[PDB]
């Protein structure tokens, strides 16, 4: 465990783990961890945490405290020398194994754990001649010795060189009852470009000790009885000749921007972010939210457009950063404003081989990195491997490197044109990618540093931009995206039953951990939003866990539509074995942008009336059409009737036992493969007797998808060229569908031989 800031805490775990995926309330993380007063075993009773969340890599935890860390005993907040343990009998944090029983809840240590403070930040307040670096500490702290050495504390530039230091007096402290600051002095000058090329400047604590000399000595509280500090590395930002008064800004939404400050900040009373920020062009700021400390600001803005920039307002006494024990100093504007860079917004499912990613501004690809490049509408996977990466659960990118250098960490990509966005004339805000494998619950997507050339990488030969071929390139986000699943299609089967395909294995799960066996009439009405006036009662899931059905309480009609209700509590993504977790919280399907219309997949009956004639009765009228962007119209003429391919593409007759289709009679004088009755409820099929003839057990089915379609509606008058249509099948001879129906034989004719014989 580590206390990283005045109100921040952090916990590590041995193996990958999981938590309620909807997030934990303040009442929840007071029921996972506890803080002991030093030297006792009765844990603190009051509420000591106020927020919580688990890091992406499933091996770090983040906590927030009710009040700032105390230098003396406090009954309601972290007091120096405290310990942390796991509350007995808890079930909110469980491991991952890929086997059902091996998801055991984290259990208490037999002994409590002592927390350890760490350094927070570092800003250079002098760079000409001997540079000076100042750091914020998380509480009252003290320095064992003032003579620092390189082997204890460093300052490194671009992971290639190290700066020299003075033998004695190279460090100092300034502390009171409510905070501390630490200073390191150098003996060389830091060039202005040292903070821009490559990885910049960072302070490295190589070693720390309680008695040794070459290792930095630093402790919490007032004296040496307090805990020892920890190793680590911190970034260093220039604020003296301002080059990093703002580190960076990124566009996480079309109406939110995230500007990152280089150190914790304080705001003067009766003031807001509408005061201490500026844009170019100018934008209105309507709201703000500050994280635990004040180092990140998210602002609600009216618009984001390419070419934007940010800066700190010129009015003094607005935004301050601590430089001494009880001293604050004001930020200063930049010579050139920070350029806002774009980033991905969100992602959702389309099917099992493709996904989509929402964008905050028009963007396009380019043929090169020069200022004469031209737009391209796609990339081959070799090139599109230099822009983004699709990550399996628990995987993340690193500084200047990708997780896909080891192929197991990332999904594969279709061997060919894999990246698609925009055209050769303009950009777009929706991006689509083709995978060489299927989507597994828990996938993410992000941009890595080879695109913009950040952190010592190399810029790609074919980059993605927001705007023209000179405007800002896309930059990585802080955490990977959380691709969301949603239903795929809603073909409606016979007369009281819908069937909704799902992109990945799923199941209902109750509000307290069980998997619902009997849905109960009350809880099936609240799964799905339907058109007003029709109530669902009874629902279920398929044996394969890839379909939900619904027994409507009244007869079904065309035009009805199904969408996932907003805020529903039960239906989740799930497979009893594949996916680690439960309803602890989180996975709960979400509505579609548009209610999905339900197609048609069921006939009513069928009869045989010859060796080469079959009748198929339908539930709702229908009219034939064409696959063009606008379906054309009904049957044309008694001669040259819908050609063989047309009927072949809307219906089929299938032998029992095998699925090889019989050949319909070729068009000719009075010979029409399929004749659609004027009523619209019947279609007749005449086979070809030179290839095969009717045989028992033959089944009717929907047809291929070459050149035709069938669109029906409530009444013949109501039919139009946009109406709900009938589904089709993948190949000429395929694996049947849920529309198959058996043929019942019957008469061909009769003829009397005598007065009492027929």
C-alpha angle 619/625/628, rounded to 5°?
135
- By the 8 A CB rule, do 253 and 259 touch? no
Q: Which of 233, 247, 238 is nearest to 125 (CA)?
A: 238
- By the 8 A CB rule, do 361 and 466 touch? yes
Alpha-carbon torsion, ordered 346, 349, 353, 358, to 10 deg: -30
How far apart (Å, rounded) are the C-alpha atoms in residues 152 and 231? 10
- Report the 10 Å Cβ neighbour count for 676: 21
C-alpha angle 241/244/247, rounded to 5°?
175
How far apart (Å, rounded) are the C-alpha atoms in residues 662 and 695? 11
Edge-to-edge strand order for the sheet containing 2-5? 2-5, 8-12, 60-65, 49-54
How far apart (Å, rounded) are the C-alpha atoms in residues 688 and 676? 18
* DSSP one-letter string for 471-528: SPBP---SS----B-------EETTTEEEEE-SS-EEE--TTSPPPSS-HHHHHTTTE
Determine whether 388 is exposed, middle or buried from the number of CB atoms within 10 Å of its CB (0-12, 13-18, 19+). Answer: buried
CA-based R_g, the chain, Å: 34
- By the 8 A CB rule, do 122 and 236 touch? yes
How far apart (Å, rounded) are the C-alpha atoms in residues 163 and 156? 6
Q: How many CA atoms lie within 13 A of 298 on its CB side?
A: 10
**Sequence-ordered list of residues with C-beta below 8 angstroms from that of 718, at least 6 positions apart, any chain:** none
User: Which pair of structure tokens corresponds to residue 749?
Assistant: 């004719």
* Resolution of the experimentally solved model in angstroms: 3.1
Alpha-carbon torsion, ordered 591, 594, 598, 599, to 10 deg: -140
The answer, yes or no, to whether the previous bond of 679 is cis (omega within 30 of 0) is no
**Sequence-ordered list of residues with C-beta below 8 angstroms from that of 405, at least 6 positions apart, any chain:** none
- Report the 10 Å Cβ neighbour count for 55: 16
Judged by DSSP in three states, 537 sits in: strand
How far apart (Å, rounded) are the C-alpha atoms in residues 11 and 112? 13
How far apart (Å, rounded) are the C-alpha atoms in residues 195 and 193? 5
How far apart (Å, rounded) are the C-alpha atoms in residues 154 and 8? 25
**Sequence-ordered list of residues with C-beta below 8 angstroms from that of 193, at least 6 positions apart, any chain:** none
- Report the 10 Å Cβ neighbour count for 329: 14
How far apart (Å, rounded) are the C-alpha atoms in residues 748 and 758? 14
Judged by DSSP in three states, 161 sits in: strand
**Sequence-ordered list of residues with C-beta below 8 angstroms from that of 27, at least 6 positions apart, any chain:** none
Q: Dihedral sign, CA of 461, 466, 467, 470?
A: negative
How far apart (Å, rounded) are the C-alpha atoms in residues 335 and 153? 32
User: Which pair of structure tokens corresponds to residue 437?
Assistant: 């494998």
Q: What are the counts of helices (DSSP H) followed by strands (DSSP E) for the chain?
A: 4, 57
* Phi (first) and psi of residue 717, to 5 degrees: -60, -30
Q: Which of 149, 86, 77 is nearest to 113 (CA)?
A: 86
Determine whether 561 is exposed, middle or buried from the number of CB atoms within 10 Å of its CB (0-12, 13-18, 19+). Answer: middle
Q: Which of 337, 342, 276 is nearest to 306 (CA)?
A: 342
End-to-end Cα distance, the chain: 96
Determine whether 493 is exposed, middle or buried from the number of CB atoms within 10 Å of its CB (0-12, 13-18, 19+). Answer: middle
Q: Solved by what technique? A: cryo-EM
Q: Which of 384, 360, 262, 267 is nearest to 319 (CA)?
A: 267
């Amino acid at each position: 465990a580590t206390l990283t800031g005045p109100k921040s805490l952090q916990v590590t775990l041995p193996v990958a783990a999981s938590v309620p995926s909807s997030g934990l309330s303040p009442a929840d993380c007071n029921n996972i961890f506890q803080l002991y007063a030093t030297g006792t075993t009765t844990p603190k009773t009051a509420a000591v945490f106020s927020a919580c969340y688990l890091g992406a890599d499933k091996q770090t935890f983040y906590l927030t405290l009710a009040a700032a860390a105390a230098s003396t005993t406090n009954a309601n907040t972290y007091a120096v020398k405290d310990l942390i343990n796991i509350k007995a009998g808890q079930s909110l944090l469980k491991a991952d194994s890929a086997t059902a029983a091996n998801r055991l809840a984290f259990a208490p240590l037999p002994d409590a754990l002592l927390i350890r403070p760490a350094i927070t930040s570092a800003v250079a307040t002098t760079i000409a001649s001997a540079a000076v670096i100042k750091m914020q500490l998380p509480l009252t702290s003290n320095l064992g010795t003032v003579n620092c050495a390189t082997t204890g504390i460093k300052v490194r530039v671009d992971d290639a060189t190290d700066k020299t230091q003075a033998n004695t007096g190279a460090c100092s402290i300034s502390s009171d009852a409510n905070g501390a600051v630490l200073t390191l002095t150098l003996n060389q000058a830091l060039g202005a470009s040292d903070f821009t090329t490559g990885k910049g400047v960072s302070v490295v604590v190589v070693a720390t000790s309680s008695a040794d000399a070459t290792k930095l000595q630093l402790f919490g509280g007032s004296d040496n009885t307090g805990p020892l500090y920890v190793t680590g590395s911190i970034p260093v930002y220039d604020v003296v000749t301002p080059g990093q008064s703002i580190v960076s800004a990124k566009a996480i939404a079309s109406n939110q921007v995230e500007i990152k400050l280089p150190a914790p900040s304080t705001i003067t009373t009766g003031n807001t972010c509408a005061n201490f920020l500026a844009f170019t062009p100018t934008r209105t700021i309507s709201s703000c939210v500050y994280d635990a400390e004040t180092q990140l600001v998210t602002a609600t803005v009216d618009q984001f457009a390419a070419g934007d920039a940010v800066n700190i307002a010129g009015a003094p006494n607005l935004l301050k950063y601590a430089t001494a024990a009880a001293t604050l100093t004001d930020y200063a504007a930049l010579a050139a404003a920070a350029t806002v860079s774009p980033a991905l917004v969100s992602a959702y499912t389309v099917d099992s081989t493709t996904i989509a990613v929402v964008l905050p501004a028009t963007s396009s690809f380019y043929s090169g990195a020069t200022n004469s490049a031209t737009k391209v509408a796609s990339l081959t996977d070799v090139e599109c491997a230099d822009v983004l990466t699709v990550l399996l659960a628990g995987k993340t990118n690193s500084a200047g490197v990708s997780a896909c250098a080891t192929p197991s960490n990332c999904r594969t990509l279709f061997s060919g044109a894999a990246c698609l966005l925009g055209t050769t004339s303009a950009g777009d805000t929706l991006l689509t990618i083709k995978l060489g494998a299927s989507y597994a619950a828990g996938d993410a997507v992000d941009v890595w540093d080879k695109n913009a050339g950040l952190n010592g990488a190399t810029a790609a030969a074919k980059p993605l931009r927001v705007g023209t071929n000179v405007q800002a390139l896309y930059v990585p986000r802080r955490m990977p995206v959380v691709i969301e699943p949603r239903i795929v299609s809603a073909s409606a089967t016979g007369a009281r039953t819908i069937a909704v395909t799902l992109p990945v294995t799923s199941q209902l799960i109750d509000s307290t951990g069980t998997v619902i066996s009997a849905p109960t009439q009350q809880q099936c009405a609240s799964l799905v939003a339907l058109p007003a006036g029709k109530s669902v009662a009874s629902c279920a899931i398929s044996s394969d866990f890839l379909t939900l059905t619904l027994t409507l309480a009244a007869d079904f009609a065309p035009g009805d539509t199904v969408n996932i209700a907003s805020g529903q509590t039960l239906l989740r993504a799930w497979k009893s074995d594949v996916g680690p977790g439960y309803e602890l919280s989180g996975p709960l399907y979400t509505p579609s942008a548009s209610a999905v219309t339900v197609t048609l997949s069921f006939f009513v009956s069928a009869t045989s009336t010859a060796a080469n004639t079959i009748v198929v009765t339908l539930p709702f009228p229908v009219k034939m059409y064409d696959l063009a962007a606008s379906p054309a119209e009904i049957l044309a003429a008694d001669g040259a009737t819908p050609t063989k391919d047309n009927c072949d593409s809307v219906i089929r007759v299938i032998p029992s036992g095998s699925t090889i289709a019989r050949t319909l009679v070729a068009p000719g004088a009075g010979v029409a493969p399929c004749v659609l009755s004027g009523s619209g409820t019947t279609i007749t099929l005449t086979l070809d007797t030179t290839v095969s003839s009717y045989a028992t057990g033959d089944r009717i089915d929907v047809g291929f998808g070459n050149s035709a379609n069938l669109r029906g509606a409530a009444t013949a008058a109501a039919v139009a060229n946009t109406s709900p249509k009938y589904t089709t099948v993948a190949t000429l001879n395929a694996a049947a569908s849920a529309a198959v129906v058996t043929i019942g034989p019957s008469i061909v004719s009769a003829a009397a031989a005598s007065p009492t014989q027929v």
